[PDB]
Amino acid sequence: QDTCFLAKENQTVLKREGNDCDQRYSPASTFKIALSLMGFDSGILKDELHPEWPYKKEYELYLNVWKYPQNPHTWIRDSCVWYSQALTRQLGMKRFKGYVDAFHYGNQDVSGDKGQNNGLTHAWLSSSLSISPTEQIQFLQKIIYKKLPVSQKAYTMTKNIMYIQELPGGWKLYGKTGTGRQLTKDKSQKLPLQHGWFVGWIEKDERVITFAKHIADSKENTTFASFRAKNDTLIQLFNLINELEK
């Protein structure tokens, strides 16, 4: 049971729980936040509903809702892997590596699964790319304070499609879940052991609190780790809101 909860307002850390705050893991689908910033900054993504791309039979259909046409809004909401891969193939390796380095995203390793030049479409899917909760906070803070080398439209559009819901007191929740598989140390193969993320921020009036939650399982589990990560996070944020509103 390795976990980590971080919440941070501006330069102050409001919460820090668990032992794994500085351990790096595959971002899994939380990389879609970085992909949204690249997509809208490069001009390949146009707005929340464009471009819309068709489902192809070749795409693995791990979730049935991925069979529908996808646009940036549904991409985040459905966590559609094949949409991410269509986007990076248009970026190309040069631009994709450039953004990953310009963003200073974790270990910045985009080589992919050992033994296949598949980093462009697999680096974030329990492969080479790796990032810690502390680094997730840094990266999200660079989004909130516009400290990344992307355009205004990329900030605006990425924020729009990361919106989830309204929390008590009127705090708005923005975020992204991600579920990955742990790897063996030798040959680096994917295990049935899960790990999962929920990262993002809550916002009300002038105030923004970024957060990052991570869970690594020791045993198998019939539930996605990202859902357990997100389900715990909402309880932390509900109690945090109650403290902030005192």
UniProtKB/TrEMBL annotation:
This is Beta-lactamase. Pfam families: Transpeptidase. Gene3D superfamilies: DD-peptidase/beta-lactamase superfamily. Belongs to the class-D beta-lactamase family. GO terms for biological process: antibiotic catabolic process; response to antibiotic. GO terms for molecular function: beta-lactamase activity; penicillin binding. Its EC number is 3.5.2.6. The lineage of its organism: Bacteria, Pseudomonadati, Pseudomonadota, Gammaproteobacteria, Legionellales. It catalyses: a beta-lactam + H2O = a substituted beta-amino acid. Residues 19-222 form the Penicillin-binding protein transpeptidase domain. It comes from Legionella pneumophila. The modification N6-carboxylysine is found at K32. Keywords: Antibiotic resistance, Hydrolase, Signal. The active site is at S29.
